[model samples]
Target: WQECMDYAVTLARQAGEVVCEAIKNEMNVMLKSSPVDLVTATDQKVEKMLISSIKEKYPSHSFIGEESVAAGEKSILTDNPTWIIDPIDGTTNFVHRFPFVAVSIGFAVNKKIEFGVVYSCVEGKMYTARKGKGAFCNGQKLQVSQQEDITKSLLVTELGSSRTPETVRMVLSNMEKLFCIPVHGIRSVGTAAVNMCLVATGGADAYYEMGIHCWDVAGAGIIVTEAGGVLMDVTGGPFDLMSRRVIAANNRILAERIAKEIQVIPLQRDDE
Candidate 1:
C-alpha cells in the first residue's frame, strides 16, 4: 500500500504538470451535461495519461474516472483496488484558466478509501492523506480548524454545474439560510476538491455541497477526515461517496448545523 500511495502522489504531480501546461494553450472547450458544465480536450488527454500510466503498473486494478463516467461508463465500487480519479476537477475553471483547477485521485480497496491525493495544479499545492496517517499540503501537516460555532465559522459551498431553475432556487435558498445565520463569510471557488482541501487545512471552517459526483469529492473526503475534520451526508447522517452530497467541517457540530440549513437539491447518484 505504501508503494500504491507513492505512485498515486507521483501520478498526481505528473498530471498537475500537464494540467498547468495546458492552461496556457488555447482551449477547445466542450459542454457536458449542461451548458455550464465544461470540458476541454486537456481533460480527456490528462485522464488518458493518468489511467494508461497506472494501468501499465497496476493492470489488475480498476478505475472510475470522471471523463470515463461522463462518456457512459458505469461508476461502481468494488472490493478490488480501484482508483477514483477526476483528471481536472474544475473544468470550468480550467477552461477559463481560473487558477483553481485540480487533479484528484483516490485509492480505494474493499470499498474504503486507503489514500488520496489532490494536486491544485494552477496553485502548485499537493494535498495528500493516508488512512490512519495525518494529512498534508506540500508536506506540511494539515489540521481542521477548531472552531465549533457556526456564527464564527467561514463556510464554503458551490452553485455546481447545474443551472436549472429549481436547482438554482434551492442553492440560493440554502445560501440565504447561511447568510441569515450570519456566518462570518461564504465562499465558492467553483472547485469541490480544493474547497474540501481548504477545510482539511483549516483555511475554511466548514463546507457543504449538494450535486457533486464521486470523482469530485472522493479524493478530498479522506483528506478531510484524516485532518481531524468530519465528513457526513448533507442530511447529517453518514457520508455516502456515491450519494452526491457532502458536509465536511472542523467538527460534527458545525457540519450538522450547516446540514440543518441545506435544502437538498436532488441529484442522480454516481452508482445509479
Candidate 2:
C-alpha cells in the first residue's frame, strides 16, 4: 500500500508539473455545456499525458479519465483496480488565468478509494491520503478545524456552470440563511478540488458545491474524510462519486447544517 501511495503521489506531482507548464503557455479554450462551461486544449493534453503514463507503468490498472470516459462507461461500480482522474478540476479557472485549480487523481480497488492525491500547481501544494494512513499536504499532516459553531466558521462555496441569475439568487438565499449564524465569510474559489483540499488542510471550515463531478471531488473527498472531515450529498446521504452534486465539510455537524440550508428547488428534468 505504501508503494502504491508513493506511485500515486509521484504521478500526481508529475501531472501537476505538466499542468503548471500548460498554464504558463497560451491555451486554446473551448466551451462544453454552456459558454461558461469550458475546456482547454491543455486539459485534454494533460489527461492524455497522465493516462499514458499510468498505463505505461501499470498496464493492468483500469482507467476512468474525465476526458476519455464514455457516457455509458462511467459507473463507479467496478471490481478491478481503477484509476479515477481529473486532469484539470477547474478548466474554466485555468482558462481564465485563475490560480484556484488542481490536478486530481484517485485510485480505487474493488469499488473503494484506497488512496488519492490532489495537486494544486499554482499554490505549490500537494494533498494526499491513504486509507487508514491519514492525510497530508506538502508532506505535512492535515487536520480538520475543530471549530464547532457555524457562526464562527468560514464557509466556502462553488457556483455551478449555469451561473444564471436564478441560480445566483438561490445561492444567495442559502448564503443569507447561513449569515444569520454570522459565519466569518463566504467565498467561491471556482474550483471544487482546491476547495475540498482547503477543507482537508484546515484552511477552510467547510465547503459546499451544488453541482460537481466525481473527478472534481473524488481525490479530495477521500483526503478530507481521512483527515476527519466529511463529504455528503445535500440530502445528508453518502457522497456517490457518480453524482454531480456534493456537500463537504470538516465535520458532520457543519456538513449537515450547510446541506439543510442550501436546499434549492431541484431541476425536475435533466434538460432543465
Candidate 3:
C-alpha cells in the first residue's frame, strides 16, 4: 500500500505537469451533460495516461476515472484494490486557465481509501495522505483549523453544474443561510478537491458540495480527515463517496453546523 501511495504521488505530480503545459495552449473545450459542465482534450488525455500507467504497474487494480466514466465506462467500487481518479478536478478552471486545477487520485482497498494524492498544478502544491499516517502539502504537515463556532468560521462551497430551478434555489438558499449564520466569509475556488485541501491546511474552515463526483473528493476527502478534519454527508449523515454529496470541515461541530444549513439537491449516485 505504501508503494502504491508513493506511485500515486509521482503520477499526480507528473499529471500536474501535463496539465500545466496544456493550460498554456488554447483548450479544445466541449460540453458534457450541460453547457456549464465542461471537458477538454487535456482531460481525456490526462485520464488515459494515468490509467494506462497504473495498469502497467498494477494490472489487477480496478479503476473509476472521471473521463472513462463519462465515456460510458462502469464506475463500480468493489472490495478490490481500486484507483479513483480525477485527472483534472477543475476542468472549467483548466479551460479558462483559472489556476485552481488539480490532479487527484485515491487508492482504495476493500472499499476503504488507503491513500490519496492531490497535486494543485497551477499552485504547484502537492497534497498527499495515507490512512492514519497524516496529511501533507509540499512536505509540510497539514492540520485543520481549530475554530469551532459556525458564526466565526470561514466556509467554502461550489455552485456545481446543476442548474435546475429547484437546484439553483437550494444552492442559493443554502448560501444565504450560511451567510446569515454570519460565518466570517464564504468562498468557492471552483474546485471541490482544492476546497477540501484548503480545509486540510487550515486555509478554510469547511467545504461542502452537492453534485460532485466521487473522483472530485476521493483524494482530498482523505486529506481533510487525516489532517484532523471531519468528513460527512451534506445532511449530517455518514459520508458516502458515491453519493455525490460531501462536507469536509475542520471538526464535527463545524460539519454538522454547516449540514444544518444545507438544502441538499439530490443527484444520481455514481455507483448506481
Candidate 4:
C-alpha cells in the first residue's frame, strides 16, 4: 500500500508539472456542456500521459480518467485495484488562467479507497493519504480542525455546474443567518476537489457542492475522511460517489449542519 501510495503521489505531482507547462503556453480551449463547462487541449494531453504511464507500468490495474471517459470511453474502476483520475480538477479556473486547479488521482482496492493524491501546481502544494494512514500536505501530517460551532466556523462552498440564480439565492439566505461569529467568509473556488482538500488540511471548516463526479471528489474525499473529517450527501446520508453531489467537513456535526442548510431547495438542472 505504501509503495502504491508513493507511486500515485509521484504521478500526481508529475501530472501537475505537465499542467503547469500547459498553463504557461496558450491553450486551445473548447466548451463541453456550456461556456461554464470547459475543456482544454492540455486536459486531454495530461490525461493521456498519466493513463498511458499507469497502464504501461501496471498492466493488470484498471484505469478511470475524466477526459478519456468523456470521449466515449468508460472508466474501468471495479472491485479490483483500479485507478481513478481527474487530469484537471478545475478546468474552468485553469482555462481562465486563474491558477486554482489540481490533478487528482485515487486508487481503490476491493471497492475501498486505498490511496489518493491531489497536487496544486500553482501553489506547489500536494495533499496525500492512504487508507488507515493519516493525511498529509507538503510532507506535514494533517488533522482536521475541531471547531464545532457553525456560527464560529469558516465555510467553503462550490456552486455546481447547474447553479442557477435561485440556487445561489437559497445558499445566500442560509449563510446570512450564520453571520454572527467565525463564519468569516464564503468562496467559490470552482474546484470541489481543492475545496475538500482544504477541509482535510484545516484550511476550511467545511464544504458542500451540488453536482460533482467521482473524479472530482474521490481523491480528496478519502483524504478528508482519513484526516478525521466527514463526507456525506446533502441529505446527510452516505455519500454516493456516482451521484455527483457531496457535502464534506472536518467533523460530523458541521457536515450535518451544512447539509441541512443546503438541502432546503432541490438543485435545478437544464439538459443541454
Per-candidate Cα lDDT values, in order, are 0.91, 0.81, 0.91, 0.81
How does candidate 3 score on lDDT?
0.91
The per-residue C-alpha lDDT of model 4 at residue 269 equals 26
Candidate 1 residue 244 Cα shift, in angstroms, is 0.4
Worst 10 contiguous positions by lDDT, candidate 2: 263-272
For all predictions, the C-alpha RMSD in Å is 0.9, 2.7, 0.8, 3.0
- lDDT for each residue of candidate 1 in 1-272, tens digit (9 for 90 to 100): 99989999999999999889989988898888677777899899999999999999999999999999878888999999999999999888887778899899999999999999999978889999999998999999999999989999899999877778889999999999998899999998979999999999999999899888888888998999999999999888999989989998889999889988878888889888
**Which prediction has more favorable lDDT, 3 or 4?**
3
lDDT of 4 by residue, 1-272 (tens): 78777888888888898898888778788988776678998899889988888888788888777887788777545687888889999998887779789999988887678878999999899998888888899989998999998877888876566556887777666666545444777777778888888889887999887656778887998889989998888788987676667878888898888776654556432111
Question: Per-residue lDDT of 152-247 in model 2, one digit per residue for the tens?
Answer: 889888657777788778877877888777899887787888888888888898998766666777788889999999888877898766666677
User: For each candidate, what TM-score against the reference?
Assistant: 0.98, 0.90, 0.98, 0.90
Q: How close is candidate 2 to the true structure, as a TM-score?
A: 0.90
